[PDB]
């Protein structure tokens, strides 16, 4: 069944509740409500799984350029610590690199139908190799220091995160249905 089966299934059955005429038994008006709830339940559900995707479909490109810079950065970073010696350049690089792989899962898990918050944009020349600490050393949105903590316990309670079902559009298609 389609969405504009449903509805029409269920602008029916109430339709047919406010029919006075016919006379319809305590039962057969019970099941009337029934269905109509299974099927306005339904046709959330899929004005949900709607809404998810308009999200998604608008923020990907944002996500998908600062997970690249992001990935570019973990790399260049992977290998001049490969090289350097120095324990104090050393310990910066350890430390940048930390910063680098978790800009790269906050780009992925980062909730999908919550609005995207960029990373990288507030850096100045976003439209050398240590021209990469500009954008490291920035400041993080407190979701980054969320998924700081969050990303152990594995990718499986990472995306448990990235899935998450906020109340506020819960609350959008929840209204958009039932009026």
């Known amino acids: 069944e389609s969405l504009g089966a449903i509805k029409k299934r ?16 305590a039962n057969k008006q019970k099941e009337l409500e029934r269905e109509l709830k299974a099927h306005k ?21 944002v996500r998908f350029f600062e997970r690249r810079k992001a990935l570019r950065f973990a790399q260049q970073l992977e290998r001049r610590l490969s ?9 910066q690089l350890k430390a940048d690199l930390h910063i680098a ?32 600490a500009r ?3 920035a400041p993080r949105p407190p979701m980054w220091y969320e998924i700081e903590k969050i990303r152990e316990e594995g990718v499986t309670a990472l995306e448990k995160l990235q899935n998450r079902a906020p109340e506020k559009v819960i609350k959008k298609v929840d209204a958009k249905v039932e009026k």
Do not use: C, W
Not at 10 to 24: G, M, Q, T
Not at 41 to 61: A, G
Not at 83 to 91: Q, S
């Open 101 to 132: 792989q978790v800009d790269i899962d906050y780009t992925k898990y980062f909730p999908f139908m919550e609005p995207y918050v960029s990373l990288y944009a507030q850096v100045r020349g976003n439209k050398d190799k240590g021209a990469a």
């Open 83 to 91: 090289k350097a010696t120095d324990p104090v350049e050393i310990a």
């Open 135 to 137: 954008y490291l050393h």
């Open 10 to 25: 269920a602008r029916a059955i109430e339709r047919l509740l406010a029919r006075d005429n016919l006379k319809l038994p």
């Open 41 to 61: 339940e339904r046709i959330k559900d899929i004005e949900f799984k709607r809404e998810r995707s308009k999200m998604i479909s608008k923020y990907h490109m």
